[PDB]
Amino acid sequence: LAPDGGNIGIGFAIPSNMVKNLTSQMVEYGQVKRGELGIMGTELNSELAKAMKVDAQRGAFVSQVLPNSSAAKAGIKAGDVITSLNGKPISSFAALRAQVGTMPVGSKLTLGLLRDGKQVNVNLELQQSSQNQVDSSSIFNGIEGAEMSNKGKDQGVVVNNVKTGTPAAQIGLKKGDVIIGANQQAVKNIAELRKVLDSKPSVLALNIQRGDSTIYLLMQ
Amino acid sequence: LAPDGGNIGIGFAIPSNMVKNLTSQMVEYGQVKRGELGIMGTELNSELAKAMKVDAQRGAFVSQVLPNSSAAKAGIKAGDVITSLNGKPISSFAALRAQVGTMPVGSKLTLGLLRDGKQVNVNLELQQSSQNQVDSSSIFNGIEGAEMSNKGKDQGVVVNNVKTGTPAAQIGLKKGDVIIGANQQAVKNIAELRKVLDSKPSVLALNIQRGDSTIYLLMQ
Amino acid sequence: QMPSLAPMLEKVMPSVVSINVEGSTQKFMALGSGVIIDADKGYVVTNNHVVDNATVIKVQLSDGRKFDAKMVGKDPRSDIALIQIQNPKNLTAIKMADSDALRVGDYTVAIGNPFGLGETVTSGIVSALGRSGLNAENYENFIQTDAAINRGNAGGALVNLNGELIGINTAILAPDGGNIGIGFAIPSNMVKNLTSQMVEYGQVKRGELGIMGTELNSELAKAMKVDAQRGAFVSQVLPNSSAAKAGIKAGDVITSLNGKPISSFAALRAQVGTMPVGSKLTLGLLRDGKQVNVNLELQQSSQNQVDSSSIFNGIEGAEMSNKGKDQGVVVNNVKTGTPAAQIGLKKGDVIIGANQQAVKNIAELRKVLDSKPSVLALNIQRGDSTIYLLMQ
């Protein structure tokens, strides 16, 4: 925080537990596979707490749970208040978001709950998601277009959603494509891919699958 | 090639084998029935060849094969390189296009292939296509509108696709029509048709079939 | 049963290459042709005007293959440059013919890359020999031919029916940049000399007779009572020159060099202008109606060559040239506002190494530069002192 781009005594750092998770994923995959509980929430402020007769001036208020979500399955109901994650008391909703927002899918966690004045304990398993990440640009450096992300196990890079006037689709890039190799090298995930690109070839020969067909997309 | 429309030492002729094929078709039909292998390709340049680890600096690179195509059936895979047609080494993709682009449908040919450093030999049969040819104009001289082409054996001239404000549809010309005669003369193909037109009648009485109905379209 | 150039060309076309160039002085692209002179080392000759001021040079064989090439020599006065394919494999060089045995009836075929279409061959005859005057500051002794030559043909081959190289296609007379039947190639004897020097030194060490002259035209010949309508007229000889020592007097006419009759003054200039210092030659002389024969030894000179720019690519400043034996590169004459002197470059400096590599001549130097270091540490001698000049 600083008017006039000079330090005044207030600065911020990402806590290291978050760095430890986020990075470790990147190492093994080239991106972060984001898991979700599938609840909508908001900061539990003192006013909201009266409205809801809860003894607690801070926490995550559950506005609603998504159907067929981890939360759902686990028994979390709307109008619940989350007070602790894995033993650790919860500053706020944002903090909560931030915590789980950095754990990998499949992680097993436990939530401190508070429904109708009664403390609750619930076991959850982080699940899939629709995380908006890694655009075609972050890997091609300048090739606007469809977003991309890993796929299943080490199954290759999947193209999420192509735009229109975006340069990527202007090389034959179509959503639903599954980059399975490049320049005679196998691509299991975004890291491998970025690796072939690190060598900086003149022509990039993408080996993709559209439906039940192998095809090749070329670049320069 | 010539800035300023004067000769400078560089001129081009269509090779005679191509003339021999193209013309012979025209003689017997009034147009060329274009056959296709149904592969997408591009020039195999030296850069692309490294990307693909191929020993070959020239040829046709197979970007992908169409499903239910001659190529498909024959066993040609994307990322293949075509090096020879019928014994004859292949300059480039264009040359290849140009060769087959002038053979008649049903022609039997054989391809020199190169997949993963290994030479391959494949037998093909030129198949149908969606060739964009003979507009209604090339036969009516000035009657814009739907495109036309022969149909099956000597079954008459078929109207491909009518436009809108095009003068042809402005005489009742509708796509899917099958000109089966004109002025009490039978029309098996575009040559026959153009023949009735050679006499230059004042009124042209087209005998067409729309669906299960015979109708007549008139001109002047 | 049909006559054809095909059998010959089949052996010969691999020798000729296309050349693409990226440069700046403002970014440009250019293209022309080149000829493989030595298959093993990947030496490729071409016109200096094609590869001049190039940041990047790529060479493409007739078979498709591309390579990168780096400069090794260049002579603007004659418009010949020598480059070298980096990592040459399985190449074909051309055999050179003796251009001095060419005659005007002779058949010629030209090979090169007009408008970047690809390797194109066209044919004609020798229309003329010894043509000069195109650019009067240069050495020029052009073969003239009506084989079609256009833009992109520069640096390419002019060969005879046996596929021997007789010239390098260089220029064309032509309003409107299209061929009209008149094109020019540097004769191959000149290429053979100029290049061979470049190989061994990075530049040409130009020798001089030290005579001033001019074309002996028919009018001048009357004025001087000489029986001869062509040749080199000696206007004056320099003191302490080869000519001087040899006994050549002003008002002499030179009619032949080494047995070979002499078209004109320009031709003469062009011949010797391409022989290396120390060469021993003999002159056909004509003083007061009497034939004379004289033995000469080509001597030093003040040749204006290799600017600091031709080796640094963009570093204006002092000119440079080899020095004595393999003694290093000497800086000729620094300017003022020129960027070179703006790095501490002072005339009289003797570049004796760079980046811990020894520099005997311009080729070696250009070699350290080929690696493209980030910082260039010049090891120079000013007077009796070693110093270091730095760049980036």
Could you please report the per-residue DSSP string of C13-26?
GGGEEEEEEEEE--
Q: Are C156 and C174 in contact (CB under 8 A)?
A: no
Interface-testing mutation among B1, B4, B10, with chain C (most C C-beta atoms within 10 A): B10
- Contact of A214 with chain B, judged by CB distance below 8 Å, is answered with yes
Q: Does B151 touch chain A (CB under 8 A)?
A: no
B21 CB neighbour count, 10 Å cutoff: 17
Q: Does B6 touch chain C (CB under 8 A)?
A: yes
Distance CA C110, CA C123 (A): 6
Q: How many residues does chain B have?
A: 220
CA-to-CA dists, residue B180 to B189, B204, C290, angstroms = 9, 13, 99
Q: What is the dihedral of CA C172, C176, C181, C183, to 10 degrees?
A: 0
CA distance A197 to A148: 15
Q: Which amino acid is at C92?
A: T
Closest-CA residue of C relative to B58 is C64
**Closest by CA position to C205, among listed C330, C311, C104:** C330
The reply to whether B52 touches chain C by the CB within 8 Å rule is no
SS3 label, residue C231: coil
Contact C182, C128 (CB under 8 A): no
The answer to whether the CB of C228 falls within 8 A of the CB of C218 is no
What residues of A are designated binding site for substrate? 1-2, 37-41
CA dihedral of A16, A19, A25, A26, whole degrees rounded to 10: -150
- Alpha-carbon distance of B137 to B146, in angstroms, equals 9
B60-65/B39-43 β-pairing: antiparallel
DSSP state of C94: P
Evaluate whether A70 touches A101 at the Cβ level (below 8 Å): no
Of A202, A215, A216, Cβ closest to residue B47: A202
Measured between CB atoms, does B51 come within 8 Å of chain C?
A: no
Whole-angstrom Cα distance, residue B43 to residue B188?
40
**Is there a contact between C188 and C167 (Cβ–Cβ < 8 Å)?**
yes
Residue type (1 letter), A88: K
CB pairs under 8 A between B and C: 38
B2 is in an annotated binding site: yes
Query: Under a CB-based contact definition with an 8 Å cutoff, are residues C313 and C340 in contact?
Result: no
Resolution of the model in angstroms: 3.0
**Which residue's entry shows tokens 């061929």?**
C179
Nearest-Cα distance to chain B for A210, in Å, is 11
Domains of chain C (ranges; CATH) run: 12-94 (2.40.10.10), 95-206 (2.40.10.10), 207-300 (2.30.42.10), 301-392 (2.30.42.10)
Answer whether C148 touches B (CB < 8 Å): yes
How far does chain C reach from its first CA to its final CA, in angstroms?
A: 64
Of B42, B53, B65, the CB nearest to A218: B42
For chain A, the chains sharing at least 3 beta-carbon pairs closer than 8 angstroms are: B
**Cα–Cα distances in Å, from C149 out to C36, C142, C152, C173?**
19, 14, 8, 10
Handedness of CA A32, A37, A40, A45 (dihedral sign): negative
Q: Tell me if chain B has a CB within 8 Å of the CB of C260.
A: no
Q: How far apart are CA C269 and CA C266, in angstroms?
A: 5
Give one DSSP letter per residue of chain B, joined into a string: --GGGS--S------HHHHHHHHHHHHHHSS--B-B--EEEEE--HHHHHHTT-S-SSSEEEEEE-TTSHHHHHT--TT-EEEEETTEE---HHHHHHHHTTSBTT-EEEEEEEETTEEEEEEEE-B-------BHHHHHSS--S-EEE-BTTB--EEEEE--SS-TTGGGT--TT-EE-EETTEE-SSHHHHHHHHHT--SS-EEEEEETTEEEEEE--
- In angstroms, rounded to a whole number, what is the distance separating the alpha carbons of residues B46 and B61? 12
The angle subtended at Cα B183 by Cα B181 and Cα B188, nearest 5°, is: 25
Q: Which of B3, B47, B58 sits opposite C177 (nearest CB)?
A: B3
Residue B215 annotated as lining a ligand binding site: no
Closest chain B C-alpha to C186 CA, distance in angstroms: 21
C44: which residues sit within 8 A by CB, 6+ positions away?
Answer: C17, C19, C34, C35, C36, C37, C59, C69, C82, C83, C84, C85
Pairwise CA distance, residues C283 & C262, whole Å? 10
Cβ atoms of C127 and C146 within 8 Å: the answer is yes
Q: Do A216 and B64 touch (CB under 8 A)?
A: yes
Q: Which residues of B169-198 are buried (b: 16+ CB within 10 A; e: fewer)?
A: bebbbeeebbbbbbeeeebbbbbbbbebee
Give C171's contacts (C-beta < 8 A, 6+ positions apart): C134, C142, C154, C183, C184
CA distance C194 to C186: 11
Has B76 been labeled as part of a binding site?
Answer: no
Q: Cβ B64–A207 below 8 Å, yes or no?
A: no
Q: Which helix (H) or strand (E) holds C285?
A: strand C280-287
At what angle are helices A16-29 and A190-198 packed, to 10 degrees?
Answer: 70
First to last CA, chain A: 43
Look at chain C and count its residues.
392
B79 touches chain A (CB under 8 A): yes
CB B41 within 8 A of CB B60: yes
Give the residue from chain B lying closest to C149, CA to CA. Answer: B9
Q: What is the C-alpha separation between B211 and A170, in angstroms, rounded?
A: 41
Backbone angles phi, psi at C6, to 5 degrees: -70, -50
Is B134 within 8 Å of B161 (Cβ atoms)?
no
Q: Is B116 on the interface with A (CB under 8 A)?
A: no
Residue B126 phi/psi, 5° resolution?
-50, 135
B176 known member of a binding site: no
In this complex, the residue of B6, B10, B46 whose CB is nearest that of residue C65 is B46
B69 touches chain C (CB under 8 A): no
Could you tell me if A184 lies within 8 Å of chain B, comparing CB atoms? yes
How do C43-47 and C80-85 pair as beta strands? Answer: antiparallel
Q: How far is CA A101 from CA A36, A129, A131, B32, B170, in A?
A: 7, 11, 10, 63, 65
Residues on chain B touching A203 (C-beta within 8 angstroms): 45, 47-48, 50-51
- 8 A C-beta contact, residue B35 and residue B107: yes
Q: How far apart are the first and last CA of chain B?
A: 43
Does B39 show up as a binding residue in the annotation?
A: yes
Are B6 and C178 within 8 A, CB to CB?
yes
